[PDB]
Amino acid sequence: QTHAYHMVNPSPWPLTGALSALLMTSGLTMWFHFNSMTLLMIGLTTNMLTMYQWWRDVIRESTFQGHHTPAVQKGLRYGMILFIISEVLFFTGFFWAFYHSSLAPTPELGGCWPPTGIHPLNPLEVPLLNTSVLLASGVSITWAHHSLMEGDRKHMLQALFITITLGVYFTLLQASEYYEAPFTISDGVYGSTFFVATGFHGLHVIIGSTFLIVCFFRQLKFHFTSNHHFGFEAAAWYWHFVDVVWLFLYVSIYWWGS
Amino acid sequence: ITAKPAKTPTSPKEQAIGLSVTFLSFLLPAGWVLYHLDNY
Amino acid sequence: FENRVAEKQKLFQEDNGLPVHLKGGATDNILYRVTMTLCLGGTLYSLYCLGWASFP
Amino acid sequence: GARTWRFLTFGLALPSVALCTLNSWLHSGHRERPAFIPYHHLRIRTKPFSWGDGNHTFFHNPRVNPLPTGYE
Amino acid sequence: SVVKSEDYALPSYVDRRDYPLPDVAHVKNLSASQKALKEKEKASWSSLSIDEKVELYRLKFKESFAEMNRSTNEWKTVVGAAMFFIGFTALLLIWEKHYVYGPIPHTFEEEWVAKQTKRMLDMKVAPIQGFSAKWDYDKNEWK
Amino acid sequence: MFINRWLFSTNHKDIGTLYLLFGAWAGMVGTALSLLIRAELGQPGTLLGDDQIYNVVVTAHAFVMIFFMVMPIMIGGFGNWLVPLMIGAPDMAFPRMNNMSFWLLPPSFLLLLASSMVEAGAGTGWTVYPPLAGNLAHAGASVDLTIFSLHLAGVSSILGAINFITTIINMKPPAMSQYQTPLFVWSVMITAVLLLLSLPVLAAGITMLLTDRNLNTTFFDPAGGGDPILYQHLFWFFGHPEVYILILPGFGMISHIVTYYSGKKEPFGYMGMVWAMMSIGFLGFIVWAHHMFTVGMDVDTRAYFTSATMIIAIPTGVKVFSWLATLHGGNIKWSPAMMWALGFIFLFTVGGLTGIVLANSSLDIVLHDTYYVVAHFHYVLSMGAVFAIMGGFVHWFPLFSGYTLNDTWAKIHFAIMFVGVNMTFFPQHFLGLSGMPRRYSDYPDAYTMWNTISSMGSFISLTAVMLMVFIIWEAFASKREVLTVDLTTTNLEWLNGCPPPYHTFEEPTYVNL
Amino acid sequence: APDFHDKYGNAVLASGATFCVAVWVYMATQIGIEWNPSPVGRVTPKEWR
Amino acid sequence: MAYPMQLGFQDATSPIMEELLHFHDHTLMIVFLISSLVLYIISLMLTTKLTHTSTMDAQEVETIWTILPAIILILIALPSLRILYMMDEINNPSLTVKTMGHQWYWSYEYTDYEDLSFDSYMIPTSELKPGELRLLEVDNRVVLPMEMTIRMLVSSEDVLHSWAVPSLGLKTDAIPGRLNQTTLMSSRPGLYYGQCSEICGSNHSFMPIVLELVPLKYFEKWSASML
Amino acid sequence: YEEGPGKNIPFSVENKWRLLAMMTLFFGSGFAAPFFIVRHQLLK
Numbered sequence A: 001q002t003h004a005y006h007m008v009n010p011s012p013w014p015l016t017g018a019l020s021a022l023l024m025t026s027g028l029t030m031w032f033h034f035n036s037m038t039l040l041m042i043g044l045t046t047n048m049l050t051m052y053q054w055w056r057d058v059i060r061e062s063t064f065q066g067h068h069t070p071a072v073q074k075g076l077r078y079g080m081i082l083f084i085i086s087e088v089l090f091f092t093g094f095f096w097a098f099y100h101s102s103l104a105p106t107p108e109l110g111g112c113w114p115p116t117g118i119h120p121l122n123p124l125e126v127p128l129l130n131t132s133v134l135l136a137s138g139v140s141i142t143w144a145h146h147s148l149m150e151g152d153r154k155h156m157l158q159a160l161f162i163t164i165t166l167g168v169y170f171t172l173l174q175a176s177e178y179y180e181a182p183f184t185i186s187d188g189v190y191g192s193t194f195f196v197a198t199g200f201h202g203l204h205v206i207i208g209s210t211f212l213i214v215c216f217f218r219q220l221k222f223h224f225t226s227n228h229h230f231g232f233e234a235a236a237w238y239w240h241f242v243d244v245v246w247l248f249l250y251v252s253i254y255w256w257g258s
Numbered sequence B: 001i002t003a004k005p006a007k008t009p010t011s012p013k014e015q016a017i018g019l020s021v022t023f024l025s026f027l028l029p030a031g032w033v034l035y036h037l038d039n040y
Numbered sequence C: 001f002e003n004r005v006a007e008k009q010k011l012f013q014e015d016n017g018l019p020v021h022l023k024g025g026a027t028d029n030i031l032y033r034v035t036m037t038l039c040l041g042g043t044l045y046s047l048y049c050l051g052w053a054s055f056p
Numbered sequence D: 001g002a003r004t005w006r007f008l009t010f011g012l013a014l015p016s017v018a019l020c021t022l023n024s025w026l027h028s029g030h031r032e033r034p035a036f037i038p039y040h041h042l043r044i045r046t047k048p049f050s051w052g053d054g055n056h057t058f059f060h061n062p063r064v065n066p067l068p069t070g071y072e
Numbered sequence E: 001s002v003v004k005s006e007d008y009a010l011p012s013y014v015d016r017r018d019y020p021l022p023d024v025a026h027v028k029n030l031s032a033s034q035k036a037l038k039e040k041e042k043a044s045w046s047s048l049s050i051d052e053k054v055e056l057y058r059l060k061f062k063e064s065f066a067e068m069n070r071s072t073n074e075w076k077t078v079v080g081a082a083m084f085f086i087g088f089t090a091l092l093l094i095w096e097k098h099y100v101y102g103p104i105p106h107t108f109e110e111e112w113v114a115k116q117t118k119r120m121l122d123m124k125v126a127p128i129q130g131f132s133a134k135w136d137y138d139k140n141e142w143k
Numbered sequence F: 001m002f003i004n005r006w007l008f009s010t011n012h013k014d015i016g017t018l019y020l021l022f023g024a025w026a027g028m029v030g031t032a033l034s035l036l037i038r039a040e041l042g043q044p045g046t047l048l049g050d051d052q053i054y055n056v057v058v059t060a061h062a063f064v065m066i067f068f069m070v071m072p073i074m075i076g077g078f079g080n081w082l083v084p085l086m087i088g089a090p091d092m093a094f095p096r097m098n099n100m101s102f103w104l105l106p107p108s109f110l111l112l113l114a115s116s117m118v119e120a121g122a123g124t125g126w127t128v129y130p131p132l133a134g135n136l137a138h139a140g141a142s143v144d145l146t147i148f149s150l151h152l153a154g155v156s157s158i159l160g161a162i163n164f165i166t167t168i169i170n171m172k173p174p175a176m177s178q179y180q181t182p183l184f185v186w187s188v189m190i191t192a193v194l195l196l197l198s199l200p201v202l203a204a205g206i207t208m209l210l211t212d213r214n215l216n217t218t219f220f221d222p223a224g225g226g227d228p229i230l231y232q233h234l235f236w237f238f239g240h241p242e243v244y245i246l247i248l249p250g251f252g253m254i255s256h257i258v259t260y261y262s263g264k265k266e267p268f269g270y271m272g273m274v275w276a277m278m279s280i281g282f283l284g285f286i287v288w289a290h291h292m293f294t295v296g297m298d299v300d301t302r303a304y305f306t307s308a309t310m311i312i313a314i315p316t317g318v319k320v321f322s323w324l325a326t327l328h329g330g331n332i333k334w335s336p337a338m339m340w341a342l343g344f345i346f347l348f349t350v351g352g353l354t355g356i357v358l359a360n361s362s363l364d365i366v367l368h369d370t371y372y373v374v375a376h377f378h379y380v381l382s383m384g385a386v387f388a389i390m391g392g393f394v395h396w397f398p399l400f401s402g403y404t405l406n407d408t409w410a411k412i413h414f415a416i417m418f419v420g421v422n423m424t425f426f427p428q429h430f431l432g433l434s435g436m437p438r439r440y441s442d443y444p445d446a447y448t449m450w451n452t453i454s455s456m457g458s459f460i461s462l463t464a465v466m467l468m469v470f471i472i473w474e475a476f477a478s479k480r481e482v483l484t485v486d487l488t489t490t491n492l493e494w495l496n497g498c499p500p501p502y503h504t505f506e507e508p509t510y511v512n513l
Numbered sequence G: 001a002p003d004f005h006d007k008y009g010n011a012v013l014a015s016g017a018t019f020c021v022a023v024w025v026y027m028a029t030q031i032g033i034e035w036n037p038s039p040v041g042r043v044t045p046k047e048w049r
Numbered sequence H: 001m002a003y004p005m006q007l008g009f010q011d012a013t014s015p016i017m018e019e020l021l022h023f024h025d026h027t028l029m030i031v032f033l034i035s036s037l038v039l040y041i042i043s044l045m046l047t048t049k050l051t052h053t054s055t056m057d058a059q060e061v062e063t064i065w066t067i068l069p070a071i072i073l074i075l076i077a078l079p080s081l082r083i084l085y086m087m088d089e090i091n092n093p094s095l096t097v098k099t100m101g102h103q104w105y106w107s108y109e110y111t112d113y114e115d116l117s118f119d120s121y122m123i124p125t126s127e128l129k130p131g132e133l134r135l136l137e138v139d140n141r142v143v144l145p146m147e148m149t150i151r152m153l154v155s156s157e158d159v160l161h162s163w164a165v166p167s168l169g170l171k172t173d174a175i176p177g178r179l180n181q182t183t184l185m186s187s188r189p190g191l192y193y194g195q196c197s198e199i200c201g202s203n204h205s206f207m208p209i210v211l212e213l214v215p216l217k218y219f220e221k222w223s224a225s226m227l
Numbered sequence I: 001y002e003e004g005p006g007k008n009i010p011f012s013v014e015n016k017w018r019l020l021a022m023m024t025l026f027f028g029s030g031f032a033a034p035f036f037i038v039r040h041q042l043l044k
């Protein structure tokens, strides 16, 4: 070849991924309707195996084999940006549901928001702490990025460790707030909007935290150069996305919706 | 477009067989179901 | 820790015709066999479940 | 530079988290739960949940989450 | 002039009325007599016979404009075959009527339709244009 | 070697071939469902004696035609085969993720056929509106299996959209601007942007329906303060973009076919064609509530959605007139693909014009949920998408296969299909104007004549489908190998021969500034 | 040299047209299809009450 | 109701339906002309051996084929919106009637004065009286006063339905938890038929609507006799 | 991998009669499926 693009070795992971999607969806069906978790647990397992092997192979292709030319890295930049846009439009649907319900509360609710019998969380207590935590993690990840660009291994690791610790603190605080909440997902459209929107956000925080932990171990193993570290860039972009979604949830559901 | 003559020419008789088999593959199973609807 | 990236570069560039998903050695083959066995076995089980669920 | 972002991390961001941790800490402790009222727009049960006895939410807290029939 | 699959990247011959002078000659290889004819072509064309002039044309080109532009009888095959397969479709519809469809409802019986028609006229269904408009209430018949 | 090649592919051509095979199989399923619909309606009374089953057949017909026939063929099949070739790229940006977009579709289809086999099926309409689609009126697994089918199809198309946008932006020759890419490539990029933005909103909405059915949420349940109308907004915010997604790659193929068989080097008004597709894509996001003119929305909202909808006719008209201006002065080759394209221009125009009638909310009150809507979308969507697919298939079959079709058989096929679809759908306009509802298993006796004719038309199109399978068999049976293709100087996809080698553009094109 | 269309086109057009008309006329008129045309100018209304 | 071999709309029973017929006539003339012009231009482009295959300048002609369509859309939109705003305009109803959709029948409530309500089911085909219409008759018709402005309020007690009467220009979705308003005014006595117009499950085809329009005095006595 | 006409496909075109059988089964199974699903639902 005399172009700069990557001809990928034939791979089984697309098929194992597609089959893991069949097993997770048929498994959710089997759990919701036939009182059984077996297919779902097989699907989750094959999904995790597929993700591990596929992204392992991308590291092999890039760090170990050198296939990530500038042209290839440019494509991955576009891919990650487009993926994030699709996730923004997914959350947009949940915000639309929330505004639809809260701006025109029906008679079943008492014709008010919050509904009769709903006691919202105080947005100045744990929700404000969660806001400080994710904003702080946006600062620490920026420190990590500049440390890596400046060639500073120790400070990159310290900054990224702080960022991960804050993501874990957010997750533990949210878990505690779920347990302590006096309302549930079954508490009408208030509970529905609150838990589905914050729940998908929580899942994205766990995914982003996992991505940062992958970057932490890759950094420990010297994979990143001061100029070439797209996995870290992508993890940082994703983490900023999770921050921004939180700020919109905080203002919309916790504060304005209280 | 230009093309070579057929490597394995399909005569009029061969075409009638292929067309007949193709039509029967669509018509017989559906026909069996629709004929037996009353029974179902 | 020490930087052992050069040793992994040599391993994954070896001229042995292996595709990248197997080029780490025998552990890759085992993890592949486990993954594909669970996927194909799970898929056959999902078809059995459809057969069961298709009748009252 | 890295030096400036570390300065912001330790000098503004983590102090903010410590202050909000203090604020949350001070306002912790259980509030008195409200009288149970079996409102029809709450404690929705259109299908049993796929775990437990079908009537408990996933992160059910007996202290603050009444069932459709009231507190446990 | 045998054209080969392995030739796809080379300049090729076409007969197209919008591309009258193609990129290559129809005939690239010349016999002894064809070589002599190409040497004769370097002298006065008045000295070429009609046969030599045609042979020069057929070395350069495959089909003439008249040949490449000719009309065909293909339309007869296409229209006839289409009408055959549309006729075959009516066999399928006969089969469906005989073996799949049972009786239609009793509301299509002649006497039902005669009574229903009167009732539609009594309720003045579409009295401006569509239906009762076409009945003469004075003469008790269709206009 | 077979498993490595066909199950583990990282090759844009072989993946495109998998999509074309999948879409052709899906089209046979969707056609059988359509014939069951028309058999139920072909005489007054009941055929199946089970209107739940009728409703399941109608629902499945739409999902199969849209998600398993048109999108896989246009985007997965033509897009994968042609886009890299038309920009001189060596493959897609993400050649391994591309294979997962493909392999998600067999499981998606399996979930849909599971939905029809368990309980009493999902007899919801392809809209899946609650509360009919909820856990009371559709208790049991069928609707959940339908939702999960849509989740997997959605992931397939979102990842494919990321692939196409990245490929088209990043993998052109460095000298080639976006304004030197062919119109088919534009049509795929714009379709991909619509997919990227619309499918996540569908995903959110059907996920809400899933939680309403299984986790005691009440997004759409007024008992909890929810609203069935919210589902309709989320669905149609996706669903109007989706109808443009279904036609845009067809517009791209029509531009190429009309150019080619007119003997032209280029389509008329290239930048107007780009402008028109981007304008249709944009306007396609601001019109959705024309699917909701009878739900009780405010008069000023109706006036806005009427007006915004009608604007789409302006860019669309530029494309129709530009196709006519491409024919103008052509050395017309009356190939079967040209006939498909000419049929497309006319039938698409008729359906687009009945769309403009429907855009008028006052008239839509009387036409909504009638056969007039069914007639509109079987013209623009059903015939427009199918005619563009058949045109593209007969035009590019010799590129993909290396073999030629019998042109006389292909012209016979076209002629039968043209008669069948017009006999089937033209009378549905009369049924709609005269008030016959859609999604009915039987009709008042007055509607018998047009239903009878419609159902007879359906059988003529069946004869065309059976002949198409024979015509493909006869091409592979006879093995007439391609020699020369005209106009390669303005059709790069042909310049590597028929079929092109597994790896093309290993050495990229040379394009200077 | 005469092709398929020169040899058979006349016969294909004549036979296809004849067959198509004959079978559609038989299907439309001889097998009990109820077309339910307009009663206007056709049906004598009859007392129903 | 529709009649056999019908091509167009049912004859107008209400002034708004009259308006919709004249608007449809105007719009259909435009659809015919544009369809016909495209087919004619196709045929014109395809019927000459004369050729011009060099690059053609687009900008002058693109002005015509944007401006002329814009003018045509304005000529459709103006009368379209005039009718939209006429239907919406304040008419002062004399009577309010509610209809509730159910799987699979309509209920009606006339509660301005007394508690009048009843259920309205399709007449089974096997029970039709001679001359009656298959799939269209009901046991209990919606009796209403003719030549009077009536407010219809539409809702549902289960899934979505849609309350339609084509000859009066009416179609209003029936949504649980929502009370949708429309206005009805018949210029004539008689029987006016419609059919459920949102898929509501297995008997969607079999829950019709029959309005019976009579003088006020007959409506008042019918109302009293239905308590 | 094999290149060229009849080799860039996951099915064999070596024998036109085996191909007819394969295409019959392929397209026929898709067209038949909805009839057999209707039969299945009727028989419950």
Ligand code: HEA
Residues within 6 Å of the ligand: F243, F244, F246, F247, F290, F291, F309, F310, F312, F313, F316, F317, F318, F320, F348, F349, F350, F351, F352, F353, F354, F355, F356, F358, F359, F360, F364, F367, F368, F369, F373, F376, F377, F380, F381, F382, F384, F385, H034, H038, H068, H069, H070, H072, H073
């Ligand atoms: C290929 C798919 C496709 C395409 C491209 C379109 C294109 C259009 N559609 Fe259609 N539509 C559907 C598929 C499609 N639609 C489907 C599937 C449904 C039903 C969904 C369901 O309910 O299941 C539907 C339903 C639908 C409705 C809802 C009706 C109802 O349910 O009551 C409306 C309302 O306005 C609408 C309008 C339009 C308009 C104005 C266009 C415009 O984009 C058309 C523009 C084109 C032209 C106008 C023709 C060419 C132009 C000229 C020659 C220029 C000159 C013209 C003028 C000046 C007018 N369509």
Ligand code: HEA
Residues within 6 Å of the ligand: F020, F023, F024, F027, F028, F031, F034, F035, F037, F038, F058, F059, F061, F062, F065, F066, F069, F070, F073, F124, F125, F126, F127, F374, F378, F381, F382, F383, F385, F386, F389, F390, F393, F421, F424, F437, F438, F439, F440, F441, F454, F458, F461, F462, F465
């Ligand atoms: C792309 C979309 C598409 C296509 C192609 C079709 C094709 C057909 N459809 Fe329709 N249909 C819909 C989308 C489509 N449909 C939708 C969205 C609905 C609404 C569902 C609902 O209400 O919820 C619907 C509803 C619908 C109804 C209304 C049902 C009701 O309201 O109760 C009817 C009635 O006659 C009908 C008939 C047909 C017929 C006879 C065909 C065809 O038989 C016409 C002929 C076309 C073909 C036979 C296709 C051929 C193509 C292939 C075989 C692919 C070949 C592949 C390659 C060459 C690679 N369909």
Ligand SMILES: CCCCC/C=C\C/C=C/C/C=C\C/C=C\CCCC(=O)O[C@H](COC(=O)CCCCCCCCCCCCCCCCC)COP(=O)(O)OCCN
Residues within 6 Å of the ligand: A171, A174, A175, A178, A179, A180, A181, A182, A183, A184, A185, A186, A195, A196, A198, A199, A200, A202, A203, D057, D058, D059, D060, D061, D065, F150, F151, F152, F154, F155, F203, F207, F210, F211, F215
């Ligand atoms: C620390 C927070 C992080 C979240 C992790 C916790 C839970 C599992 C995963 C969460 C994923 C996110 C959202 C899924 C929907 C619902 C969960 C919402 C968050 C949550 O956890 O909600 C809980 C309910 O969980 C329930 O029902 C449990 C439901 C469990 C099964 C979920 C069903 C999966 C849904 C399918 C997903 C579809 C994805 C589509 C992708 C798009 C493709 C195009 C709240 O508990 P509660 O007792 O009601 O109230 C508290 C009272 N003290």
Ligand SMILES: CCCCCC/C=C\CCCCCCCCCC(=O)O[C@H](COC(=O)CCCCCCCCCCCCCCC)COP(=O)(O)OC[C@@H](O)CO
Residues within 6 Å of the ligand: A051, A055, A056, A058, A059, A062, A063, A068, A076, A080, A083, A206, A207, A208, A210, A211, A214, A223, A224, A225, A228, A229, A230, A231, A232, A234
């Ligand atoms: C408990 C929850 C369970 C749910 C399952 C999901 C859970 C966790 C998933 C976490 C994501 C981890 C992703 C790890 C990616 C590792 C590979 C990587 O980062 O690869 C990099 C390329 O990036 C690339 O492919 C970029 C790859 C981007 C991928 C990430 C996108 C997020 C994934 C979301 C998954 C589903 C979410 C949907 C939710 C509805 C490699 O290039 P460099 O870094 O430049 O290195 C090269 C240099 O060494 C040369 O000098």
Ligand SMILES: CCCCCCCCCCO[C@@H]1O[C@H](CO)[C@@H](O[C@H]2O[C@H](CO)[C@@H](O)[C@H](O)[C@H]2O)[C@H](O)[C@H]1O
Residues within 6 Å of the ligand: B027, B028, B029, B030, B031, B032, B034, B035, E092, E095, E096, E099, F035, F036
């Ligand atoms: C929408 C797609 C369908 C279009 C219509 C299909 C056209 C008909 C194809 C023929 O189908 C066959 O018809 C036979 C009858 O003619 C059936 O035999 C049935 O009837 C015979 C005669 O009574 C018996 O001898 C057989 O046992 C019995 O199965 C047979 O089963 C069925 O396969």
Ligand SMILES: CCCCCCCCCCO[C@@H]1O[C@H](CO)[C@@H](O[C@H]2O[C@H](CO)[C@@H](O)[C@H](O)[C@H]2O)[C@H](O)[C@H]1O
Residues within 6 Å of the ligand: A034, A035, A036, A037, A038, A039, A042, C037, C038, C041, C042, C045
């Ligand atoms: C790599 C190969 C892939 C692995 C394939 C795994 C196949 C084996 C699955 C075991 O099957 C299980 O059998 C149980 C019955 O014995 C079911 O119990 C469930 O159904 C019971 C019915 O008795 C109930 O008690 C409960 O709901 C529950 O225990 C359960 O659903 C089901 O999954």
Ligand SMILES: C[C@H](CCC(=O)O)[C@H]1CC[C@H]2[C@@H]3[C@H](O)C[C@@H]4C[C@H](O)CC[C@]4(C)[C@H]3C[C@H](O)[C@]12C
Residues within 6 Å of the ligand: A153, A154, A157, A158, A161, C001, C002
């Ligand atoms: C000693 C070691 C050196 C790393 C190296 O050069 O290989 C240091 C450098 C950065 C350190 C990490 C970071 O300083 C941040 C964390 C600090 C905690 O106190 C221990 C874990 C923690 C995650 C550290 C683990 C370990 O001690 C690291 C990795």
Ligand code: NA
Residues within 6 Å of the ligand: F040, F041, F042, F043, F044, F045, F046, F047, F441, F442, F443
């Ligand atoms: Na019927």
